[PDB]
Amino acid sequence: MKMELQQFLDALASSPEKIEFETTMAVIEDNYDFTPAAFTNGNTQNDANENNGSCKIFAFGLLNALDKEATLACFGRFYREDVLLHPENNDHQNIRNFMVTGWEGIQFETSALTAK
Amino acid sequence: FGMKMELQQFLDALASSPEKIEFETTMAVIEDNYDFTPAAFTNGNTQNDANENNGSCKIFAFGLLNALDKEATLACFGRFYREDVLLHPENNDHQNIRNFMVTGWEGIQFETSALTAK
Ligand SMILES: [K+]
Numbered sequence: 226m227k228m229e230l231q232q233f234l235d236a237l238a239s240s241p242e243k244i245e246f247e248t249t250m251a252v253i254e255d256n257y258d259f260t261p262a263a264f265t266n267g268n269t270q271n272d273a274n275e276n277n278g279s280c281k282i283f284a285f286g287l288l289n290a291l292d293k294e295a296t297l298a299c300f301g302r303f304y305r306e307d308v309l310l311h312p313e314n315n316d317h318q319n320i321r322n323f324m325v326t327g328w329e330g331i332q333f334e335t336s337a338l339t340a341k
Numbered sequence: 342f343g344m345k346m347e348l349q350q351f352l353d354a355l356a357s358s359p360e361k362i363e364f365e366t367t368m369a370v371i372e373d374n375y376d377f378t379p380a381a382f383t384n385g386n387t388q389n390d391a392n393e394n395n396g397s398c399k400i401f402a403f404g405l406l407n408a409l410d411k412e413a414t415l416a417c418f419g420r421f422y423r424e425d426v427l428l429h430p431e432n433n434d435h436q437n438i439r440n441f442m443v444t445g446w447e448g449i450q451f452e453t454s455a456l457t458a459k
């Protein structure tokens with residue numbers, strides 16, 4: 226995963242419950258050039274350089290035509306544990322907002338990633 | 342003059358009656374509502390270099406931005422899909438379309454963002 230895209234993508238397709246935020250970060254960093262971008266995500270607005278981890282997953286899920294579920298898997302434990310196990314909390318508003326509004330709620334002001 | 346295609350009406354119209362969607366209509370919506378940036382992308386068994394099959398490039402990116410369904414993204418090709426491709430499965434006309442129908446979003450991968458909302 227960490228350096229090669231397709232294996233990550235296959236793992237994500239095979240065993241989403243098993244990917245970890247740091248493995249998404251690794252893949253994205255090893256395969257894309259990142260440029261900070263503002264983006265909105267349903268209710269939330271991220272300025273450039275803000276919630277970069279989220280910025281990376283959304284932009285990577287856009288390049289990769291990831292469905293809503295696989296995109297949430299990319300957030301690893303912050304999704305599977307912090308957020309999914311706790312509906313009454315307001316922890317990690319990019320995850321919580323994407324769960325509601327999904328890909329329709331995402332909107333980049335500018336392109337965040339380009340393949341190396 | 343002063344006539345911009347409204348995105349949401351397109352998408353609702355696309356929702357209720359896909360078969361009435363025309364390709365020029367898609368081209369119009371997208372050109373009025375987004376900045377286009379030539380991007381290479383693969384689509385199952387086709388690869389498009391930057392600026393290659395731009396029509397296709399724009400529709401797929403537009404189906405990504407609007408969280409469109411496979412079938413709905415296909416409706417955007419208008420008659421190229423509805424007539425050229427769907428009436429003639431034996432043929433090899435329009436590989437991006439024929440390709441997407443098989444591999445769907447799973448087969449799509451962009452090198453870089455093709456579209457960005459105005
Ligand atoms: K894909």
Ligand code: NA
Nearest residue numbers: 328329331406
């Ligand atoms: Na959107």
